């Protein structure tokens, strides 16, 4: 692990990866909110593309909203959320936590005229991050905040709090870290040698399974049937390990799994 | 650093690689991410096969440099 993954560091630089897997956790239990993973301002084709498919998705009644940490440059992300509003209106919000007008951001509001000229624009310009290392921790509170309808942090509470919401964020990171491990570990011994297995495969490999107790397996399995194997799909190593990870077997045993 | 594979169904894979990384290892990724056998993957950058031995630094990938990846047929 290189020395720029240290979450003790009070300076440590959110990842993409970072932001998604928080937003996930604090509102991923409700299925109609889509997170947007990856998207970024020096990418004008596949933002519209992004953009387009969340619209059509709240307009279509799929999904209720959207959060959108939307990459503008060196560790700088900004908050965008999208909502269905009262008066049958399609509302943006926004905050760059550095405070700039989404105005400087021509590429993004040419982008929303010429996709939604129709939709409102509340840019909140709240001027939050005092560092440069702390925009990740208020994307990802703000977009909290904005998909819950609640006002975001002001700029004073933003610095009496910086530091508490950091640490609540990491304390998650590091938590999740040792479930993503503890589930990839696991992963590997029911994947063997394969390139892909199926879901039913999965189920045979954890009845067989000779490190695992009778309980463990039979928790493990109520864990997947409760959402998956339905149509016997086929998983990869990556789909496994995020399928196990999402288990309250792995998320209860996670340290027992690595030692 | 971040590196892209083009497929010859128009996606782009996204991996994340260091220069010291094999080829080899390079595969184990894709194989991890898109569930192909690393026997079947033929990684091309730049008009250069890669040999599985070799390491990223060996062919110069750079940040957000592009792959091609082609499968092999039968085998």
Same mark, same amino acid.
């Given at each position: 692990?290189?020395?720029?993954?240290?979450?003790?560091?009070?300076?440590?630089? !959110?990842?993409?990866?970072?932001? /998604?897997?928080?937003?996930?956790? !604090?509102?991923?239990?409700?299925?109609?909110?889509?997170?947007?993973?990856?998207?970024?301002?020096?990418?004008?084709?596949?933002?519209?593309?992004?953009?387009?498919?969340?619209?059509?998705?709240?307009?279509?009644?799929?999904?209720?909203?959207?959060?959108?940490?939307?990459?503008?440059?060196?560790?700088?992300?900004?908050?965008?959320?999208?909502?269905?509003?009262?008066?049958?209106?399609?509302?943006?919000? !926004?905050?760059?936590?550095?405070?700039?007008?989404?105005?400087?951001?021509?590429?993004?509001?040419?982008?929303?005229?010429?996709?939604?000229?129709?939709?409102?624009?509340?840019?909140?310009?709240?001027?939050?991050?005092?560092?440069?290392?702390?925009?990740?921790?208020?994307?990802?509170?703000?977009?909290?905040?904005?998909?819950?309808?609640?006002?975001?942090?002001?700029?004073?509470?933003?610095?009496?709090?910086?530091?508490?919401?950091?640490?609540?964020?990491?304390?998650?990171?590091?938590?999740?870290?040792?479930?993503?491990?503890?589930?990839?570990?696991?992963?590997?011994?029911?994947?063997?040698?394969?390139?892909?297995?199926?879901?039913?495969?999965?189920?045979?490999?954890?009845?067989?399974?000779?490190?695992?107790?009778?309980?463990?397996?039979?928790?493990?399995? /109520? /864990?997947?049937?409760?959402?998956?194997?339905?149509?016997?799909?086929?998983?990869?190593?990556?789909?496994?390990?995020?399928?196990?990870?999402?288990?309250?077997?792995?998320?209860?045993?996670?340290?027992?799994?690595?030692? | 650093?971040?590196?892209? %594979?083009?497929?010859?169904?128009?996606?782009?894979?996204?991996?994340? %690689?260091?220069?010291?990384?094999?080829?080899?290892? %390079?595969?184990?990724?894709?194989?991890?991410?898109?569930?192909?056998?690393?026997?079947?993957?033929?990684?091309?950058?730049?008009?250069?096969?890669?040999?599985?031995?070799?390491?990223?630094?060996?062919?110069?990938?750079?940040?957000?440099?592009?792959?091609?990846? %082609?499968?092999?047929?039968?085998?």
């Amino acid at each position: 692990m290189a020395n720029d993954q240290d979450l003790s560091n009070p300076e440590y630089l !959110y990842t993409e990866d970072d932001i /998604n897997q928080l937003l996930k956790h !604090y509102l991923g239990l409700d299925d109609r909110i889509s997170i947007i993973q990856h998207v970024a301002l020096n990418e004008s084709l596949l933002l519209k593309q992004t953009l387009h498919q969340v619209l059509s998705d709240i307009f279509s009644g799929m999904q209720e909203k959207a959060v959108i940490p939307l990459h503008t440059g060196n560790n700088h992300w900004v908050a965008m959320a999208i909502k269905l509003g009262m008066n049958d209106d399609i509302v943006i919000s !926004y905050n760059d936590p550095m405070g700039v007008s989404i105005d400087d951001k021509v590429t993004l509001i040419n982008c929303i005229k010429e996709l939604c000229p129709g939709a409102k624009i509340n840019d909140l310009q709240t001027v939050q991050q005092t560092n440069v290392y702390d925009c990740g921790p208020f994307v990802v509170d703000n977009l909290i905040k904005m998909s819950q309808g609640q006002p975001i942090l002001s700029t004073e509470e933003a610095k009496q709090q910086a530091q508490n919401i950091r640490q609540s964020q990491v304390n998650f990171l590091s938590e999740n870290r040792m479930i993503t491990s503890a589930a990839a570990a696991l992963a590997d011994t029911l994947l063997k040698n394969n390139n892909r297995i199926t879901e039913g495969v999965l189920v045979d490999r954890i009845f067989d399974n000779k490190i695992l107790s009778v309980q463990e397996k039979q928790q493990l399995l /109520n /864990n997947l049937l409760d959402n998956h194997i339905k149509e016997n799909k086929s998983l990869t190593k990556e789909s496994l390990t995020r399928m196990l990870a999402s288990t309250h077997f792995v998320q209860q045993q996670a340290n027992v799994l690595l030692n | 650093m971040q590196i892209f %594979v083009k497929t010859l169904t128009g996606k782009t894979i996204t991996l994340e %690689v260091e220069p010291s990384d094999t080829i080899e290892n %390079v595969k184990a990724k894709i194989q991890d991410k898109e569930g192909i056998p690393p026997d079947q993957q033929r990684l091309i950058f730049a008009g250069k096969q890669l040999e599985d031995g070799r390491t990223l630094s060996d062919y110069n990938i750079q940040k957000e440099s592009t792959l091609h990846l %082609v499968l092999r047929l039968r085998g």
